[PDB]
Design a protein around this ligand. Structure first.
Ligand code: BA
Ligand code: BA
Ligand code: BA
Ligand code: BA
Lengths: 375, 375, 375, 375
């Protein structure tokens, strides 16, 4: 009923390291809302363990959270946006914890707070790791054999390397497989035009964010010079970005991340615009534990618009480098959401439905750092 | 955990008559979700007791509701939209009942399902009834005396009559009172320009929907030839309408109605667009009982964006011809939400927080009609 | 010379059921104007037997029709539009009966009131019934043998099924046949782009309404990614919709339905915009009797613009499961308009030129329902 | 049933001379459709007695009219448009006679073919003749005394002269009188800006076509620099002109002339665009007899859109230089439409309801010219 303690724990996870943060919102009635920010990326989000910890502990905690009723999510989300510019991941982390606390308080899974369980399970697609073309092709076949619905490749370059990678993978998987690449906005306009055209013979279902996030005119110009659908990820962050994207005709589809959107509530608003745009939405993740994947799992199962498309919320599979969750027993979440046969099933327990492995969390606290508590 | 019976009751409520419909969604575990569609308007909404009854009983009931889990609001709202074009009021009614049922099932007020109680009370303004200018001016003073925050006049015409009314009211109340008029989209472009300019000396705060709902280009042209702010009501119904409004610059403010939007969930999406447009929003009502006013009361108290502006959700005051709810003793709602000092307070009981006077409901069933039940 | 009673009859006609309504406008001089609303579609139009019956009987009858001169069509159509939002089908029905009454009064066929008999007969195309690809291809060949001018397929999905259907039909009919599909606005942007490109090898003449009625920006964006012409049906309802379509370049062609347009008079206005846009127009129907097909038959033979293109007004052929009218003898219309050799011939008698089988009409009254009369 | 003879009579009517043409479409069953093209204007329309006579007799007659069924108005109008560019007044004349013949054949007034009699009478406004401002002011007072609804002035020039005229008239008539001026597209952009601003102190209800017909950019630019509403006349001729006007926001209102539009059918289409634009429309005339006034009289009483505004169809009052029609005995129409108390009443006889004064017609044949007949 009242938040009385805000605790931020800096953790580092090895994968085969991921620097993230865990948040605990203690209430005056025993219940504790928890959340995992997921990995931190200087280029994709621009937030770090320390920026997230300071913004939550030095600002959100004393100015918005302490003494507040956690059920007032619209209110808190609004106050955080007024108080702070950007810091989407920090805000998202708090939002996740609030929903967890509220769900625990009302005795219901978070998807019940997000509109109900629209679908029982979420079909998933997966991104492959870097490697030699022959190796990436082998990993692709393994992903498909497991049941995944699409294969996504990262395009580091040079051109010769990207072409070789795509050609080998397409050769192995066949022409019926949904195969696309992600550029992370690394190309100049000319690079994009040249490379996308050189790849046309491989029939990729789409090209994800080929140009910089801010180059909306470029994305629109590109779409008028190439056949391959162009999806926006980094470009589609805020509500006004989405408006600009539809107005400039800068995309054929969209990617979302709960941390990019700024939280579950902000994600719902984000999805309202995607719906208005009548565009497909694929949700990814900020590589993290079973707790990091939970907010999205609940959202992807509840949101009617996003419930229409295959997803990419598979942080745990990336950290534990495997294709399903039965092959995972040392995650900070004792009960990692179920990943099976290419599908994600959201947990059904109260709140986010995650029980933390407290001893592992203690063992994974970032060397040289410590948890911070605010009351 | 399942809806087993859909009941629609046609009622006629005398003023000081309002033809509407009540909805009852019976679950297999005793709980019943209730809702009041409110008044029906052929020109404002285009729906009637009969259209709502048939769309709910002949379509939504067998195809979407019966046998479904009422907590799956996102899912149900989506299916109703795919199944049926328009019929926003019928859809809203179902949405209202669902939220009421879910709230009762979870033991929480609907505002908790809409993001929490952002504000404890809602400042209200009121629309005055037709009459001689002197009489209208007197009701205005009575309204302000009670604490209400603004006075809205309905402009019926002709020109000389509209000027007389506004002139008398402005004289009576003073220059520091928020006064504005509603045209309900009755003017041709020229009439608008002429009248608005003729009224300028009275410094109205705004003109509500001067042109037809579909004339967005005209609304934009108008804002180019007059000083007075132009607000859209009938023009702002669907999500794509709001997009068009912001793209064309067809409005300085917006009017919403839960029945127009299509339900609470649809209204939340509607308000996401209002937020993006950074425009004020004033919620009205389809003149009804305390039950009709409840969904809006919950939304107006929860939604962060709309919690910033004074509202106009006061149907019970109009039916019972009073300025505060202590003076209401014969409403279908045994516990009419509190209307006091110009403020609206949402009930805090589970669901919509309304207890029906089953005896009065039976007495108000529209003559010649009967309740309909579907299993 | 004066409407003295409005009668609405709810009927259900079995296939080889269709729920519609019949309208009778009795005059004080013996003449009676009749009309058939045709089938009712929750998703396509949003009107039902009850909604139409109530708007006509509870609103149009006492407020606009009773005591009025039926020849004042411009006036009545205007008042109906001021009085009621949407309800296009109900309005259309009244318009049809008025034209029938005025025609009977002047002793002339309705086409004379619509500008004269521009063409003698109307070339037709036909939509095929659902079924296995092989079965649909067989029906397609039967259709072409009778003389029909094009074959339209309803695309339901999933992708593989649509491709299978189209592939098989094209194989059987050959490359010289005009073949196209109708999506009824069921696709999201990506689905459309994907499926449309996947079907290019079958050279469809066009894709009818691939995206939602409201997604004009999507329709335009789509036209920028595919070669196949894109036609609008659901998107082209009101005059302002048509304006938006020409301004946005959202279509290569249009489809109309008298019931969608809102009546014969509004259909002429609709066609004035089609002319200005210099776009082809194919008129469909709300599947019904010879009476339902008559208003459209008169319009398609009279309107100079629409008389340039093949049409799809063949409700009686669908109800009675045949390819020509000589094979019909149990329709509510004793004299069903001539459907022969792939052409539709408007009747030449006064008004709509239809004489009802009163006995069958009484036999088809919807079980549990009853005709309504207002004086 | 069939047109067997086309007759065109060149006439010159002195005023208080006007060069026009009369048309007679003879049928094989005795009935004859008649029409008066009205005055000819080289600058406003660009057609003459000779151009009209030749286009009708040398082209329309042999290629479209002779041997055709006059009831096929949509067809005939379409064929004339395909066969001939421009020549709107000639096409209009033929259209007028067709409606007259059809009305005569069916035994109904033309307004019955145009949608019925929406209004009983047409409120009128009047344009004043040139002269000294004192003289113009007296004429204005007499006009208002008769009951006319507005006063229109012609802007001759230079600026000093226009100011004096407007100031004097405005002084004599009062502030509550609808007063405006017509420039006939005679100004360059700078002239308009200057004169309109110099006239702002007189509160003219609008400025009619201040810039050239083709200068739509200028009309839009002008509205961006002055408060006075700008109406389009010469700029609003064809359907595509109307579209360009609404897209560019070049007008606050519109003026129409049946001869400019190209006939009654083309006028109805013209008015459909006016309706879509939600703009007022004032119909003028090409100074002529009671026969020239008849087509418009029927149209202004029938068309629902134009029946909303005061009109300026008063040819006979100009030719006979009077304020009502009781004082008219020597017009080529024996029964001039009733012009009384500032209102115009359409005739109720078959067709256009006009009987020609054959003796006067022969007396008015243009000196040196003769009637032309084609079979
Ligand atoms: Ba990316
Ligand atoms: Ba309103
Ligand atoms: Ba369709
Ligand atoms: Ba002029």
């Amino acid at each position: 009923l009242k938040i009385t303690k805000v605790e931020v724990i800096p953790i580092s996870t090895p994968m085969k390291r991921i620097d993230g943060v865990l948040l605990k919102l203690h209430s005056d009635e025993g219940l504790v809302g928890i959340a995992d920010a997921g990995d931190t990326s200087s280029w994709y989000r621009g937030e770090t363990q320390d920026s997230i910890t300071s913004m939550i502990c030095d600002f959100f905690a004393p100015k918005v959270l302490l003494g507040e009723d956690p059920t007032k999510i619209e209110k808190i989300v609004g106050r955080m946006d007024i108080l702070t510019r950007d810091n989407n991941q920090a805000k998202a982390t708090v939002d996740f914890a609030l929903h967890d606390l509220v769900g625990k308080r009302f005795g219901v899974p978070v998807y019940q707070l997000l509109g109900g369980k629209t679908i029982e399970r979420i079909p998933l697609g997966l991104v492959l790791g870097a490697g030699e073309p022959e190796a990436v092709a082998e990993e692709a076949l393994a992903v498909l054999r497991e049941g995944f619905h699409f294969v996504k490749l990262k395009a580091g370059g040079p051109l010769k390397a990207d072409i070789a990678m795509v050609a080998e993978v397409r050769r192995a998987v066949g022409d019926d497989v949904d195969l696309f690449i992600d550029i992370n906005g690394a190309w100049t306009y000319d690079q994009a035009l040249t490379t996308i055209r050189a790849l046309e013979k491989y029939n990729l279902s789409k090209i994800e964010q080929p140009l910089p996030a801010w180059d909306l005119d470029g994305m629109a110009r590109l779409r008028g010079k190439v056949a391959t659908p162009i999806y926006a990820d980094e470009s589609a962050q805020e509500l006004h970005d989405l408006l600009a994207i539809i107005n400039k005709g800068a995309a054929d589809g969209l990617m979302i991340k709960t941390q990019k959107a700024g939280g579950l509530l902000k994600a719902q608003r984000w999805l309202t615009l995607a719906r208005l745009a009548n565009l497909p939405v694929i949700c990814g993740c900020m590589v993290g534990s079973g707790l990091e994947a939970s907010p999205a799992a609940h959202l992807l199962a509840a949101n009617d618009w996003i419930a229409q498309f295959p997803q990419e919320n598979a942080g745990p599979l990336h950290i534990h480098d495997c294709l399903n969750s039965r092959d995972i027993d040392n995650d900070i979440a004792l009960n990692v959401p179920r990943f099976e046969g290419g599908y994600l099933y959201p947990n059904d327990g109260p709140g986010l439905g995650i029980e933390l492995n407290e001893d592992l969390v203690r063992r994974l606290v970032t060397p040289g750092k410590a948890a911070r508590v605010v009351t």
